Structures are given as structure tokens and as C-alpha cells.
Amino acid sequence: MTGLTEEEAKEFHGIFTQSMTMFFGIVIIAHILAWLWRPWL
Amino acid sequence: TGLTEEEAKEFHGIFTQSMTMFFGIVIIAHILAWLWRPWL
Amino acid sequence: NSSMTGLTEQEAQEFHGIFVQSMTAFFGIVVIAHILAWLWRPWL
Amino acid sequence: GLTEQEAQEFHGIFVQSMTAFFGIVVIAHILAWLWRPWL
Amino acid sequence: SSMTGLTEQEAQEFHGIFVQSMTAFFGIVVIAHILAWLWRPWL
Amino acid sequence: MTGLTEQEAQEFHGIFVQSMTAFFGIVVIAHILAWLWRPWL
Amino acid sequence: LTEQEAQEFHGIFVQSMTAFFGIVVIAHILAWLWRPWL
Amino acid sequence: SMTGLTEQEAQEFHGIFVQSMTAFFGIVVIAHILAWLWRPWL
Amino acid sequence: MHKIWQIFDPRRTLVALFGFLFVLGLLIHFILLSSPAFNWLSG
Amino acid sequence: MHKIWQIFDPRRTLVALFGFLFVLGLLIHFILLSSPAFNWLSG
Amino acid sequence: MHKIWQIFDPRRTLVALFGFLFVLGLLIHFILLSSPAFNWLSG
Amino acid sequence: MHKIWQIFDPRRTLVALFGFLFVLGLLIHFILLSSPAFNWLS
Amino acid sequence: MHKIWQIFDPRRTLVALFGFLFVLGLLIHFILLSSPAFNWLSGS
Amino acid sequence: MHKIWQIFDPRRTLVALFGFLFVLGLLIHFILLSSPAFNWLSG
Amino acid sequence: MHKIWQIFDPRRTLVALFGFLFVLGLLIHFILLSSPAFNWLSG
Amino acid sequence: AMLSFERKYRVRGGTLIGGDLFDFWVGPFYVGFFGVAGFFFALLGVLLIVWGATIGPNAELQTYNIWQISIAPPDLSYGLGMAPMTEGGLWQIITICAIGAFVSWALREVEICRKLGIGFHIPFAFAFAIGAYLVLVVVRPILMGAWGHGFPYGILSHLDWVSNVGYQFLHFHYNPAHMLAITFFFTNCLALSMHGSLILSVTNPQKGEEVKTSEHENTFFRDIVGYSIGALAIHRLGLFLALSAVFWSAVCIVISGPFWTRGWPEWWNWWLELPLW
Amino acid sequence: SPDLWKIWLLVDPRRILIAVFAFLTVLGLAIHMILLSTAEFNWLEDGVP
Amino acid sequence: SPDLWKIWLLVDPRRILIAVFAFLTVLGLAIHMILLSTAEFNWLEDGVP
Amino acid sequence: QLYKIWLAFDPRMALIGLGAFLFALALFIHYMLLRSPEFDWLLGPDYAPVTLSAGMSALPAGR
Amino acid sequence: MSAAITEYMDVAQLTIWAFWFFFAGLIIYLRREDKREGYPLDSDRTERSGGRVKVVGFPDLAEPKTFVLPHNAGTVMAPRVEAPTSINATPVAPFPGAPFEPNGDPMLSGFGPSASPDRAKHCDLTFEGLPKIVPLRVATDFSIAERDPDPRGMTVVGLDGEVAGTVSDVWVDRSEPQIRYLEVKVAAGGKNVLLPIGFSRFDKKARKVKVAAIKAAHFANVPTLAKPDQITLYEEDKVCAYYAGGKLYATAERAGPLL
Numbered sequence A: 001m002t003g004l005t006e007e008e009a010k011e012f013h014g015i016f017t018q019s020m021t022m023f024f025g026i027v028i029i030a031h032i033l034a035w036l037w038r039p040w041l
Numbered sequence B: 001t002g003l004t005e006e007e008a009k010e011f012h013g014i015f016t017q018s019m020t021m022f023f024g025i026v027i028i029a030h031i032l033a034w035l036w037r038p039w040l
Numbered sequence C: 001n002s003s004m005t006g007l008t009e010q011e012a013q014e015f016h017g018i019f020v021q022s023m024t025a026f027f028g029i030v031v032i033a034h035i036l037a038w039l040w041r042p043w044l
Numbered sequence D: 001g002l003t004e005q006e007a008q009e010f011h012g013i014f015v016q017s018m019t020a021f022f023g024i025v026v027i028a029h030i031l032a033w034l035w036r037p038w039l
Numbered sequence E: 001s002s003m004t005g006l007t008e009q010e011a012q013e014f015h016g017i018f019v020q021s022m023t024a025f026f027g028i029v030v031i032a033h034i035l036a037w038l039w040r041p042w043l
Numbered sequence F: 001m002t003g004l005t006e007q008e009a010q011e012f013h014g015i016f017v018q019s020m021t022a023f024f025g026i027v028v029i030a031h032i033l034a035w036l037w038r039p040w041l
Numbered sequence G: 001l002t003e004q005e006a007q008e009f010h011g012i013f014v015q016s017m018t019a020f021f022g023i024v025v026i027a028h029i030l031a032w033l034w035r036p037w038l
Numbered sequence H: 001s002m003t004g005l006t007e008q009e010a011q012e013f014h015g016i017f018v019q020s021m022t023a024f025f026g027i028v029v030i031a032h033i034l035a036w037l038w039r040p041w042l
Numbered sequence I, J, K, N, O: 001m002h003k004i005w006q007i008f009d010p011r012r013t014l015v016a017l018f019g020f021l022f023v024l025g026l027l028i029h030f031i032l033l034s035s036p037a038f039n040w041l042s043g
Numbered sequence L: 001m002h003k004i005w006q007i008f009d010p011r012r013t014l015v016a017l018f019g020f021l022f023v024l025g026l027l028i029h030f031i032l033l034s035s036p037a038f039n040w041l042s
Numbered sequence M: 001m002h003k004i005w006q007i008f009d010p011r012r013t014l015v016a017l018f019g020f021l022f023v024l025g026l027l028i029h030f031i032l033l034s035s036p037a038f039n040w041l042s043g044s
Numbered sequence P: 001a002m003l004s005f006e007r008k009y010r011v012r013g014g015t016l017i018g019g020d021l022f023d024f025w026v027g028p029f030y031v032g033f034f035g036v037a038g039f040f041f042a043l044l045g046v047l048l049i050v051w052g053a054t055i056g057p058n059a060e061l062q063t064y065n066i067w068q069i070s071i072a073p074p075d076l077s078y079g080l081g082m083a084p085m086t087e088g089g090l091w092q093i094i095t096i097c098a099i100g101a102f103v104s105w106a107l108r109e110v111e112i113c114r115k116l117g118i119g120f121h122i123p124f125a126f127a128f129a130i131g132a133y134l135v136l137v138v139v140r141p142i143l144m145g146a147w148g149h150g151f152p153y154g155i156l157s158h159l160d161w162v163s164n165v166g167y168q169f170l171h172f173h174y175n176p177a178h179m180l181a182i183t184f185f186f187t188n189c190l191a192l193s194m195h196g197s198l199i200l201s202v203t204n205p206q207k208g209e210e211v212k213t214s215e216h217e218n219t220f221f222r223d224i225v226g227y228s229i230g231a232l233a234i235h236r237l238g239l240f241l242a243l244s245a246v247f248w249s250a251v252c253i254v255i256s257g258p259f260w261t262r263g264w265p266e267w268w269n270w271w272l273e274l275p276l277w
Numbered sequence Q, R: 001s002p003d004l005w006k007i008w009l010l011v012d013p014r015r016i017l018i019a020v021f022a023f024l025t026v027l028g029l030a031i032h033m034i035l036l037s038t039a040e041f042n043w044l045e046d047g048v049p
Numbered sequence S: 001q002l003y004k005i006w007l008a009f010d011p012r013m014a015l016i017g018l019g020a021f022l023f024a025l026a027l028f029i030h031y032m033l034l035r036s037p038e039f040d041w042l043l044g045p046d047y048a049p050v051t052l053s054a055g056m057s058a059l060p061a062g063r
Numbered sequence T: 001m002s003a004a005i006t007e008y009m010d011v012a013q014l015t016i017w018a019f020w021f022f023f024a025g026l027i028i029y030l031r032r033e034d035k036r037e038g039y040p041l042d043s044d045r046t047e048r049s050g051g052r053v054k055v056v057g058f059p060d061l062a063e064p065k066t067f068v069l070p071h072n073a074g075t076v077m078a079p080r081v082e083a084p085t086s087i088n089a090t091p092v093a094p095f096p097g098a099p100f101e102p103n104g105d106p107m108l109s110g111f112g113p114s115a116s117p118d119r120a121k122h123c124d125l126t127f128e129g130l131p132k133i134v135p136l137r138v139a140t141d142f143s144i145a146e147r148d149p150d151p152r153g154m155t156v157v158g159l160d161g162e163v164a165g166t167v168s169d170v171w172v173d174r175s176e177p178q179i180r181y182l183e184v185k186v187a188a189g190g191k192n193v194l195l196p197i198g199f200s201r202f203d204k205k206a207r208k209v210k211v212a213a214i215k216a217a218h219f220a221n222v223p224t225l226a227k228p229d230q231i232t233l234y235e236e237d238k239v240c241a242y243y244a245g246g247k248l249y250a251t252a253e254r255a256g257p258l259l
């Protein structure tokens, strides 16, 4: 047990995914831009 | 010892599915890698 | 019960507002600097 | 510190896991042999 | 209390003197950079 | 609070700026003589 | 340290400082005559 | 009094201290005079 | 996102963030100075 | 054979055995890579 | 901004700030002294 | 600015300031000595 | 002969034996790999 | 300036003072000896 | 000046002074022997 | 954050310089006057090393490879004067910062010792390591007459300096003080392994046994080598061995070039030419 | 899994976020440094434009 | 095996999650390093494209 | 009234401190003169450096 | 097999990388061992969080190991939960990291250099179960070496030079024969107090024991022993800590700074 309430786990997980996909989306755009700049394969 | 029986079963459900998702992505990456540059 | 940091709801909102305003100003200055850097010497 | 009954269950799974792990190993060695025999 | 033991009044009073000291320091810096640019531009 | 009661601090500050401005004036004279000796700009 | 011992020490300390300073200035005058540096 | 000493020995210790100082510096003065005549460094 | 400050102490976060940013700023400037193509003090 | 686990702890044996097997697999793979007749990463 | 002194205590923060500024000031002068185009002591 | 002495103790600050000023003066003299155009002992 | 393990602990003796057997097996395999006449990974 | 001797201990201040002057005197003599144009022990 | 023996131990200082002079006499002889201009055992 | 037993020890005072001005903690660290001085001595020296790596020996050879970064001392032709920043002057500045940081660290340790009311053995022991560094970059270069005799600041480059200095005497193993210092280094490592083993084997005994005693400790090495130095004395010995190793290492390098210019094996000719043989 | 949220009952989110942020920062620095260390992908030394 | 789930009764699942993620990250980093070290599979210094 | 130094410094430590300092300083200055070839008296009063002829060099080429 | 793993990778490069992974695990192991005492940390982070955030750093704490004490003295767990202890001091300033000023007489505050934990109220035992630290009057087989002076009878002198008492007995360690304490008959009161050998500087010529830690007057307040012929581990810490407090508290100038 991590000291967190069970509702906090649901609420943290939702925000964690939103921040993770937002980070992942910026990464994917960066790699598309990087691929257009200089493809490596 | 610690985790009970029911949550032990449930943990396996997400463990097996998430690991299977990782394995499937690995297979796709290796299929792509083989088409890119086969090693055998 | 207190949260994991002791900040209340209003305190966390109050810090977050100043944090994002400070972040926005820092990032805005950063964007201006990079535009000036690009005009001076494009790197790509 | 581990009683006999839970010992009976553990050995069955361990043998199954060992047999499952062994089977993958046998196929890999067969495939390796076809790819490049060593003996 | 606060993380630092400073009240609302004390922090605001310190911030005022901090900011004017910061502004005077920045003002000299800006003049220094203007003089430096006149002496030898770098960009 | 260091125990300086806003009047001792004011009284010390007066002597501090006075000595500091004396030091700064001596420094300014030295830099003028240094510039007359070998200008650096 | 009482204020009376502060008066005594300051007089001697200032006197010794001034004597050391005066000897230093004489040395720098002689050094300048020997070999000017500026 | 922090050295565990009185007002008498300190006075006579000082007088001997300068008396030894004067002789030691006098030998130093003569040594430097002879050294300068032998080989001046300036 | 203001709830990140209910899990992370703002004081320690700001110390870590300000320190990382200062090191990052030094690092990027140093990298540019090490490249003759971008050293702005070469002439 | 099932009664082995009386003395040997099931839990510590698994991590010890898995760790042993893993470094054994690394060693065998690396030995083959060191062999020009079995290195699969060359031309 | 004046709440920051309820987060960062003036005594420790000012010591860190002044030293970091002085070291930063020293570093930039040393960088310029190392750069032949901007060494003002080169003659 | 007189209130800075209510944050930093003056008698302690003077010692710290003396060391900083002396160490800075030492550094500048050394930097000038490292520069042939401003080395005054050449 | 059935009177061997009343003194030697089963766990300790197996642990010492298993480590020794692996080391001997590793050593012999490495010696053969080091001998050109018995190297099975050399190509012939 | 006169009551400084109550703030600063005369015994410890002097020990620090003479030690500083000795090191400073040693350093300047060392600097002159290191300077070829002011080395009085050469020819 | 006889009071110097109330300060310093006559027994310890005589051993120290005899020890110090003896070493001083040794080193000077060894230095002279190591100097060709003063070595008296060479011809 | 402090240890769970530490708060009752965080007392005011015990400073050498500064009094209450810098008498505080930053996280686990005690700062004091020499924490402020030491930190910004180290910070400046570290940044100058990074700057020294940024310009490199020249623009062609400049590298950020951590093994290859090297800030080199001046050429020997600069003597004991100051060199230009890109020609060894940066090394001279970093050396000054390093001395400032090392000494401040030792003096900060003294203030901590005063706060805790313990012996000053640790700062005293650290002074030996500082003294060895001072011998390498100050005492020996001054005796030789040039700052260029100091070792370069680089993870691998200072090994090339050690290698070449050693071969300036054709066989450095024959240096007598070097032999003595290595003996102390090797013995210290042996003593450390023995002391670490004995404490661990007594407080973590075989399973089913209680914690052993100091009687066991004395008996164990009496049973092995016939002598036990004792629980207190092993720490005297460990400190003595480590400090003697560094002292004799400092002696060995300071006699290599200032007080001996020949090959080191030739130094033993005093023994070979004894008239007994 | 729709019950993947249960990971935050087992692992400490505060320590996990610190670990992932530290890992991601180091990884981002490492990849950039590796790219700059190659002739082909060093965007500062490539001479383009 | 109908009772593979019993692995989570003896060893803490939280430790496995971190250990597996840490181990896989290291294994992934190592394989990438090995491939980069090969002239055949180095995607940064091969000239393709 | 210059005794006050002896009310704040023990006669014994200062006298030993003075002797160690004076001996060390004298050794140091004596060594510095020996360091300088001009004041190296250990070379002898009638010391003459070796004459170099026919392209001789005392030292090998440097850098 | 061969030395070349790939065109670039070789066996030595693999071996050094293998060490780095082992070494990383070793450092993690050692740091976890380091944290068996004093963790979780006493932090403001925990205080504002109401105890909901335990400050352990990385790596986290290890599972408690068991120390079985000899002679049935008990069993201790190296990582153990310790009840918070109040401090007889107050912060000199309200910012984090500020030091505390002891309350009351600093020599009696039990704070700073005079602070000590409460150890077990049992004597350290020899291998045979006897108390380890005992006076010479009960350890009759022990004696002072002939070449060394007998501490008994020597005048005990405080930091100021004033006489503090006389040495009545010598307490010795019966496991490793050595002096650990000097029993002093205090000149003022007469009540016997212990003086650790670590705070005692012997003057063999003058037959004096010089204690720089505390003044002669401070000897009256040295913590006393319950039983006259033995000392518990708790009492040992109390006595030693009291003298240590004098290194900072006995004289006003000992607080510093020098200049």
C-alpha cells in the first residue's frame, strides 16, 4: 500500500495517461519532423 | 504471504495481457527489422 | 486529512497559477531568443 | 519452512515451467542446427 | 505557518527591497552590455 | 532577525556606506591612474 | 575586554600600524629608485 | 593572567626579550653589511 | 494539473527545476561554444 | 523429487536460477558472437 | 511574486544567489579572456 | 537597504567581505600578470 | 553408505556440490574450446 | 573606529593579521622572484 | 638571563641542543663533501 | 532531511569563521562559512574545467569525451609566472580553486567536529590527502621551478603524466620512498579487508548463533596469526597505514626530480658500494 | 486493461514519477549526445545550411 | 498451466513490476548498443539513406 | 609597557615558536641564495663555469 | 571463440560493462545497508504531509535484519521504528536548516554535543556474562602496568586549571584490558563521578589528570551511576555525552567564531 486512497488511484491514473499521451504526441511529431529533416533508415 | 488469492488471480490478468501487448509490439518491431535488414 | 504535501486545495491552485505564469513568461522569452537565434544563424 | 502440500503444488508447476522452457529451447536448437550445424 | 517562517507582510516587504536591488543590478548590467556592444559587437 | 533593531542597522549602515564610498573612491582613483598608464579599451 | 583596555590597545595598534606603514613606504621608494615598475 | 603570570616576570621577560632582540638584530645587521660588501644584490 | 502540487512538494520541485534549467542552459551554451560553426566569440 | 522444496526456498531459488540462466544465456550468445563461424551480426 | 519568500527563505536563498551570480560573472569574464577576439587584456 | 543588517550580521559580514574583496583583488592582479600587455613586472 | 547424510546438511552439501559441478563443467568446456582439436565453434 | 576591540578579540585579530601580512609578504616576494625582470638574486 | 632554565627543562634542552648541533655538524660536513670546491678527500 | 536521531545534534555555534551568518544546513549538508566558500570554489573550478574542455587543446582536438578531457598546465618556459588562460593559465586558476575547495572542505569538517564535540582526526587525516595534492601541484613545481611540472586535469591525461614522470627516472619501482608507500598502501588494504571481515563475521555470525563478542574478535586473530591488535587499535593502525602511505607517497614524488635526477635504481648504489662487499 | 489503474495502489506514484522523469531526462540527453557524436546527425557541424 | 497465477503469492508484485521494467530497459539498451557497434546494423553511421 | 604580549601569549610557546620560525626562515633564505647561481657560495670563491667551444651545448634541444 | 565480439565490441569492453552492472547493484546494496539506522528521515517533507510521505531516498529501506544478543539480552532489528524524541532546544531562526539553541544551561540541556540516545539500561557483558566495565576494586586480578603510573591518587584538573578532585579508582574493560573510566572524588561535593579516558590527558610528571572538556565546577553535575560497581550502556552514553557538551558549552569563547 502506497498511502493513497482508492479514488486517488483512479484520478491519478487518468491524469497520468493524459500527460503521457500528450508527451507521446509531442515525441511522435518530433520524430516525424526529424524523419522529414534527415531519415535514418 | 501478503497478497491474497483473489488479487493474485487478478494481477495475472493485467500482467498476462500487458506482457502480451509488449510481446506483440516486439514481434511487429522484429518483423519490421527483418524486412529492414535480415540477420540470418 | 492533509495531502501528500500539506498544501490545501486553494494553496495548490495558487501555486499552480503563479507557476504557469512564471513558466509561460520563461517559455515566451525562450521562444523570442530562439527566433532571434534563428535569424542570426539558422542551424537546420 | 514450506510445508508438504504447497510443496506438491510447487513442483508440479515448476516441472511444467521447466518442460515448457525446455521445449522452446529444443526448437531453438533445432532451428539453430538447420541454420548452421556445429558438430 | 510558511515553509520559511515568513509572514505575508514580511515576505512582501523583503520582496520590495529585493526587486529594487534586482532592478538596479539589471540596469547596470543593461548599460554594461550596451557599452560592451558599442566596444565590440558579438552577434 | 539578527538582533539589529532597525536603528543599530541604520547606524551601522551609515558608517558602512561611508567606508564603502571611501573604498570606491580610492578604487576609482587607482583605475584612472591605471587607465593613464595603460588603457585597456 | 573593558573600554579602558580598548583605549590602550587602539593607541598601540594604531601606532604600530603607522610605523609599519611608514617603513613600507620607505621600502617602496627605495625599490622604485632601484627598479621602477610603471 | 591567562598565561598564569604576574606583573613582575612579564616586565623582566620583556627586558631580556628586547636585549636578546637587539643583539640578534645587531648580528643580522653586521651579517648583511658584510654580505653587501662581498656581493651586493642590488 | 494543479494537483501535482499535492503530490510533489513545490519547494523541492522548484529547487530541482531551477537547478536542472541552470545546468541545461550552461550545457547548451557550452556545446555551442565548442562548435566553431556556432561559437559567437570567434570574431 | 517434489519434496526438494523443504530445504530450498522456492522464492530465492527462482531468482537465483533465473539470474543464473540469464547470465548463462548472455555468455553463450557472446561466445557465439566472438566466433566468426557463428557471429550473425556480420556481413 | 512575493510569495516566493514564503517558499525560499531569504537568508539561504540570497547566499546561494549571490555566489551563483559571482561565479557566473567570473565564468563569463574567463570565457571572454579565453577568447582572442574579446580578450580586452590582449593589447 | 539598511535592513540587510537585520538579515546578515554586520560583524560577521565584514570578515566575509574582507576575504571576498582580498580574494577578488588577488585574482584580478593574477589575471593581469598572466597578460603580457599588462604584466607590470616585465 | 546410507549413513552419509546424518552429518552433512542436505542443503549445504548440495549448494557446495552444485557450484563445484558448474565450475568443473565450465572449466572443461572452456579448455576444449581453447584446444583447436576439440573446438566445435571454429568452423570445422 | 575604536570600540572594534570589543567586537573583535585583540589577541586573535592580531594573530590573523600578522599571519595574513606574512603570507601576503611571502607571496609578493615570490612573485618578484618569479619575475625575471625583478629577480634580485640573479646576476 | 638565567631564568630561561625556569622556563625550559635543562635536561631536555641539553639533549636537544646536543642533538641539534650534532645533526647540524653532520649536514654541513656532508654538504661540503658533496661540494667539489670544498671536498677535502679528493686530492 | 535529517536522520531520525540527528535533530538533537543540530546545535548553533562551533564555527571557526562566520558565527551565525552562514551557520545553517542545506538539506543534509552543513554549510557554514567554509561551505559557502568551498562550494563556490568547487563550482567555479568545475565550470572552468568544463570551459577548458569546451575549447580543448585546440579546436581540432577539442572533445567532450569524459576520458579525453584534459586541462593542461603551462609550458615549462612560463616558469613560476602566470600563463595565458588558453596556455595553462586556466589550469593555474583551477588549481587555485581546487586548493580553495579542498582547504574549505577541511575547515568545514573542523566546524562540524566542534559542533559534535568529537576529535579532529578526520580533518587532520584529510589534510594528509590535501598535503599530497599540494606537493604534486605546488611544492614540487616550485622546487623544479615551473608550474608546468604539475599534472594535467584530465581523467586519463594525468595518467600519461604519471607514466612519463615515472619513466623520467627509468625505473620508478626502485624509488625507496615509493617502495615504502606501496608497502603501506598494500598493508592498509590487507588490514581493511581483515577489519571489515572481522566486524562483519562477528555481528553476522553463522545461522542459529547470537552476536559474538570482543573476546571472539581477539581470539580469532590470535588463533590465526598469534596476535590481536584490539578493537580500538585496529583503527589506530588503519589510520596510521593510510596516512603513512600518503606521507611516503608525497615524499617519493617530491624527491623525484627536485632531490634526485638520476634513474632510481642507481640510488641504491650507496648500498652496492658499501666496502663490506 | 480497464483495471490498469490498480498499479497506483502497489507502486508509489511520487517515486515512480521522479524515476520516470529522471530516466526520460537522462535518455533524452543521451540520445542527443549520441546524435551529436556522429558525423551524420550532428546538426551543428553538418554545415547545413 | 492453470495455476501460473500463484507466482504472485510468494514474491511481492510491486518489486517484480519495477524489476521487470528495469531489466527490460537495460536489456533493450544493451542490444541497441551491440547493434550500433556492428558495421552491418548501425543505423546512424551506415549512409542509408 | 610592552609586557602585555606575555599576558596573552605564553612565554614558552612564543620562544619555541619564534625559534622554529627563525630557524625555518634562515634555512629558507640560505637555500634561496644557493638556488641562485650568483649567490651559490658552495661553488667556491674562484668558481669558473666550463668554457664551451666548437659548437658545444650543455643541454639538448628543447621545445 | 575470439576476442572480437563485433567489429567494435571486444571481450574486455564486455567485461568492463559487466563490472559496471555488478558495481551498480553493489552500491545499491551498500546504500540500503547504510539506511538500516536513522531512516526514514526526520524531515519537514514528512511533517507537512502529516506523516503520509516517508523520506527514505534511493534506494528504499531494507527488510529488518535480526541481531540476537548474547546472554539472552534480547533481539534487536537493525531497521527499527523509533519513537520521536523531543529536543531541549529551540530554533534560532524559522527557516529550514536553521540550527537550534539549547534551553536552560547548555551543559545540562542534553542537546547538541551534550545529547545522547537512551541506550539499554543493562551493562555490557564479557563472554562469561560478567559486567565488562568495572572498577579495579572488583576486578582484583587486573593491575596497572609497572612502567606506567598508577592513575589512583592523581589530582584531576578542569579546563581552567582549577583542581576538580582526585582519582579514587580506575574502571577497566575486562574483555580487552584497558582503562575506560576514571572514578573522581569531586573536591566540592565528594560524590564520586566517572571521567572517560578519552577526556583525560595524563601529566605523568605532575601526577595530574587534565580535563579540557569541562571546568572543575562542571564535575559536580556529571551523571551518576545507579550501582556503584557497574555501569549500564545507557549510563555510559550519558557520562560521555556530558563531557562532550563542555567542548562547546563550558566556556563562552568555545562557541566561536575565532575572528
Ligand code: BCL
Pocket: A041, B018, B019, B021, B022, B025, B026, B027, B029, B030, B033, Q031, R021, R024, R025, R026, R027, R028, R029, R032, R035, R041, R043
Ligand atoms: C536497430 C534497428 C532499429 C531498432 C530496432 C528495434 C527492435 C527489433 C526493437 C526495438 C525496440 C525499441 N526500440 Mg528500437 N530500433 C532502432 C533505434 C532506436 C532508437 C534510436 C534513437 O536510434 C531508440 C530510442 C529506440 C527505442 C526503442 C524502444 C522504443 C524499444 C525498446 C524499449 C524497451 O526496452 O522497453 C522495455 C521497457 C519497458 C518499460 C516496456 C514496458 C512494457 C509495457 C507494459 C507495454 C506498453 C508500454 C507502456 C505504454 C509503457 C511505455 C513504455 C514504452 C516501451 C515506451 N530504438 C533502430 C532504428 N528496436 C523493441 C520494442 O519494440 O519494444 C517495445 C524491439 O523489439
Ligand code: BCL
Pocket: H024, H027, H028, H029, H031, H032, H035, O028, S015, S016, S017, S018, S019, S020, S022, S023, S026, S027, S030, S033, S039, S041
Ligand atoms: C650567503 C652569504 C653567507 C651567509 C649570509 C648570511 C646573512 C645575511 C645572515 C646569515 C645568518 C646566519 N648564517 Mg649565514 N651565510 C652563509 C653561509 C652559512 C653557513 C655555511 C656553512 O654555508 C652556515 C652554517 C651559516 C649560518 C648562519 C647562522 C649562524 C645565521 C642564521 C641564524 C639563525 O638561523 O637563527 C635562527 C635560529 C634560532 C634558534 C634563533 C634563536 C632565537 C630564538 C628566540 C631562540 C628560541 C629557542 C627555543 C628553544 C626554540 C628552539 C628552536 C625550535 C625548538 C626548533 N651561514 C653564506 C656564506 N648568513 C643570519 C644571522 O647573522 O643571524 C644571527 C643573517 O642575517
Ligand code: BCL
Pocket: A018, A019, A020, A022, A023, A026, A027, A028, A030, A031, A034, I001, I028, Q021, Q024, Q025, Q027, Q028, Q029, Q032, Q035, Q041, Q043
Ligand atoms: C535529430 C536531432 C534534432 C532533435 C530531434 C528530436 C526528437 C525526435 C525529439 C527531440 C526531443 C527534445 N528535444 Mg530535440 N532535437 C534537436 C535539437 C535539440 C536542441 C539543440 C540545442 O539543438 C535542444 C535543447 C533539444 C531539446 C529537446 C527537448 C525539448 C526534447 C527532449 C525533452 C525530454 O527529454 O523530456 C523528458 C523529461 C521530461 C518529460 C520531464 C519533464 C516533466 C514535464 C514538465 C511534464 C509536464 C506535463 C505536461 C503537462 C504534459 C507533457 C508535455 C511535454 C512535457 C512538453 N533538441 C535536433 C535539431 N528532439 C524529444 C521530444 O520532443 O520530447 C518531448 C523527441 O522525441
Ligand code: BCL
Pocket: C022, C023, C025, C026, C029, C030, C031, C033, C034, C037, E043, I018, I019, I021, I022, I023, I024, I025, I026, I029, I032, I040, K028
Ligand atoms: C548562441 C546564440 C546566443 C544565445 C542564444 C540563446 C537562446 C536560444 C536562449 C538563450 C538563453 C539564455 N542566454 Mg543566451 N545566447 C548567447 C549568448 C549568451 C551569453 C554570453 C556571455 O555570450 C550569456 C551570459 C547568455 C545567457 C543566457 C541566459 C540569460 C539565458 C539562459 C537562462 C537559463 O538557462 O535559466 C535557467 C535557470 C534558472 C531558471 C534558475 C534561475 C532561478 C531563479 C531564482 C528563478 C527564475 C525563474 C523566474 C521566476 C522565471 C524565469 C523567466 C523570467 C520571466 C525572467 N547567453 C549567444 C550569443 N540564449 C535562453 C533564454 O532566453 O531563457 C530565458 C534561451 O532559450
Ligand code: BCL
Pocket: D016, D017, D018, D020, D021, D024, D025, D026, D028, D029, D032, J018, J021, J022, J023, J024, J025, J026, J029, J032, J038, J040, R001, R004, R031
Ligand atoms: C546464435 C543463433 C541465434 C540464436 C540461437 C539461440 C538458441 C539455440 C537459443 C537461443 C535462446 C535465446 N535467444 Mg537467441 N539466438 C540468436 C540471437 C539472439 C538475439 C540477438 C539480438 O541477436 C537475442 C536478443 C536473442 C535472445 C534469446 C533469448 C530469447 C533466449 C535466451 C533467453 C535466456 O537466456 O533465458 C534465461 C532467462 C530465463 C530462463 C528467465 C525465464 C524466462 C521464461 C519466460 C520462463 C518462463 C517459463 C514458462 C515458459 C512459463 C509459462 C508456462 C506456461 C504458462 C505453462 N537471441 C541468434 C540469431 N538463441 C535460448 C532459448 O530459446 O531460451 C528460451 C536458446 O536455447
Ligand code: BCL
Pocket: G020, G023, G024, G025, G027, G028, G031, H041, N014, N015, N018, N019, N021, N022, N023, N024, N025, N026, N029, N032, N038, N040, S005, S009, S021, S029
Ligand atoms: C624586491 C626588492 C627588495 C625587497 C623589496 C621590498 C618592499 C617594497 C617591501 C619589502 C618588505 C620586506 N622585505 Mg623585502 N625586498 C627584497 C628582498 C628581501 C629578502 C631577501 C633575503 O632577499 C628578505 C628576507 C626580505 C624581507 C622583507 C621583510 C623584512 C619585509 C616584509 C615583512 C612582512 O611581510 O611582515 C609580515 C609579517 C608580520 C608583520 C608578522 C610576522 C610574524 C609571523 C610570521 C606571523 C605569525 C603570527 C604571530 C604568532 C602573531 C602573534 C601576535 C603578536 C605576538 C602580537 N626582503 C628585495 C631585495 N621588501 C616590506 C616591508 O618593508 O615591511 C616592513 C615592503 O613593503
Ligand SMILES: CC[C@H]1c2cc3[nH]c4c(c3C)C(=O)[C@H](C(=O)OC)c4c3nc(cc4[nH]c(cc(n2)[C@@H]1C)c(C(C)=O)c4C)[C@@H](C)[C@@H]3CCC(=O)OC/C=C(\C)CCC[C@H](C)CCC[C@H](C)CCCC(C)C
Pocket: P038, P041, P042, P043, P044, P045, P046, P049, P094, P097, P098, P101, P102, P105, P109, P122, P123, P125, P126, P127, P128, P129, P152, P153, P154, P155, P156, P158, P242, P243, P246
Ligand atoms: C590521506 C589518506 C587518504 C585520504 C583521506 C581522506 N580523504 C578525504 C577525507 C580523508 C580523511 C575527508 O574527510 C574528505 C571527505 O569528506 O571524504 C568523504 C576526503 C575526500 N577525499 C576525496 C577524494 C580522494 N581522496 C583520495 C585519497 C586519499 N584520501 C588518501 C589515499 C583520492 C585519490 C587517491 O585520488 C581522491 C580522489 C573526496 C571524496 C573528499 C574531499 C571532497 C572535497 O574536497 O570536496 C570539495 C571539492 C569539490 C566538491 C570539487 C572540487 C573541484 C575543483 C575546484 C576542480 C577540480 C580540481 C582537480 C585537481 C581536478 C583533477 C581531476 C583529474 C585528476 C581526473
Ligand SMILES: CCCCCCCCCCCCO[C@@H]1O[C@H](CO)[C@@H](O[C@H]2O[C@H](CO)[C@@H](O)[C@H](O)[C@H]2O)[C@H](O)[C@H]1O
Pocket: L033, L036, L039, L040, L041, L042, N031, N034, N035, N036, N037, P077, P078, P079, P080, P081, P082, P083, P092, P093, P095, P096, P147
Ligand atoms: C599557479 C598556482 C597558484 C600559485 C599562485 C602564484 C601564480 C604565479 C605567480 C605570479 C607571478 C607572475 O610573474 C610574471 O610571470 C610571467 C610569466 O612567466 C613573466 O613573464 C616572463 O616570462 C614569460 C614566460 O616565462 C615570458 O613569456 C615573458 O616574456 C616574460 O616577461 C613575468 O615576467 C612575471 O612578472
Ligand SMILES: CCCCCCCCCCCCO[C@@H]1O[C@H](CO)[C@@H](O[C@H]2O[C@H](CO)[C@@H](O)[C@H](O)[C@H]2O)[C@H](O)[C@H]1O
Pocket: J027, J030, J031, J034, M033, M034, T001, T002, T003, T004, T011, T014, T015, T018
Ligand atoms: C562478462 C563478460 C563476457 C565476455 C564474453 C566472454 C566470452 C568470450 C571469450 C573470449 C576468449 C578469447 O579466446 C581467444 O581469443 C583470441 C583473440 O581473438 C583468439 O585468437 C585468434 O583470433 C585472432 C583474431 O582473429 C587471430 O589473431 C587468430 O585467429 C587467433 O589469435 C583465440 O583463438 C581465442 O582462444
Ligand SMILES: [Ca+2]
Pocket: C042, C043, C044, Q042, Q043, Q044, Q045, Q046, Q047, Q048, Q049
Ligand atoms: Ca545544421
Ligand SMILES: [Ca+2]
Pocket: A039, A040, A041, R042, R043, R044, R045, R046, R047, R048, R049
Ligand atoms: Ca541509416
